[PDB]
Amino acid sequence: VNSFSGYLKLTDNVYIKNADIVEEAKKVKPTVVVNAANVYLKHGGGVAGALNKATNNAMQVESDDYIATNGPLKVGGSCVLSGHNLAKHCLHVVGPNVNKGEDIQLLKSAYENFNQHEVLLAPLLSAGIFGADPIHSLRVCVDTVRTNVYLAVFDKNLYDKLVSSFL
Ligand SMILES: O=C(NS(=O)(=O)Cc1ccc(Br)c(F)c1)c1cnn2ccccc12
């Protein structure tokens, strides 16, 4: 028994809610929050910018040090950094950005990173400003992640569409 509230159960291990992931993280303070990162860990917009802004830019400062030491992530890759005021840890995961010509097949690889963590608060990877079909992202999530994932989808219209079309 954990502290997540108001989620709709989709499968044995996948749950969903129409919520802002930043507000959810501030309220729950989960072990792991997932960031929709890019390979440079440049947190300007979407989930990354909003989490980062909520950390008063401490996430970006930590991220720049990580990149200066390790170089960029791979598309489909991840790294674990601090969750600052929002979570114990932040799992920065790079889904393919369709708007940059990245291979959508890498979305499954991106979701595989979630399997290294027992429980996660996460957004829908490659959705919104990353340019991929959100219904597809949810399908890949359900078919790839085996650990307990609590999904926060910002858009009510999209949330309702995701639930109503879910197989
Ligand atoms: O990215 C999120 N949810 S989402 O479903 O995965 C992708 C998505 C987001 C907004 C729109 Br409009 C859309 F069409 C698709 C999301 C969840 N909290 N949060 C907070 C700040 C910014 C973003 C987010």
Strand order of the largest sheet: 1-2-7-6
For the sheet with most strands, the description reads: 4 strands, mixed
Which class in CATH terms? Alpha Beta
Rg of Cα set: 15 Å
PDB class: viral protein
Keywords: Macrodomain, ADP-ribose, SARS-CoV-2, viral protein
Assembly: monomeric
Entry title: PanDDA analysis group deposition -- Crystal structure of SARS-CoV-2 NSP3 macrodomain in complex with ZINCou000000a2Hm
Give a topology summary.
Elements: E1 8-9, E2 14-18, H1 21-28, E3 32-36, H2 46-54, H3 58-70, E4 78-82, E5 89-93, H4 106-112, E6 119-122, H5 134-144, E7 148-153, H6 156-164
Parallel strand pairs: 2-7, 3-5, 6-7
Antiparallel strand pairs: 1-2, 4-5
Helix pairs in contact: 4-5
The chain binds the ligand O=C(NS(=O)(=O)Cc1ccc(Br)c(F)c1)c1cnn2ccccc12.
The ligand O=C(NS(=O)(=O)Cc1ccc(Br)c(F)c1)c1cnn2ccccc12 is lined by residues 20-22, 46-47, 50, 123-124, 127-128, 134, 152-155, 158.
Membrane topology: Multi-pass membrane protein
Subunit structure: May form homohexamers. Interacts with N protein.
Protein name: Papain-like protease nsp3
How would you sum up this structure in a few lines?
The chain has helices at residues 21-28, 46-54, 58-70, 106-112, 134-144, 156-164, and strands at residues 8-9, 14-18, 32-36, 78-82, 89-93, 119-122, 148-153. It is α/β, with parallel strands linked by helices.
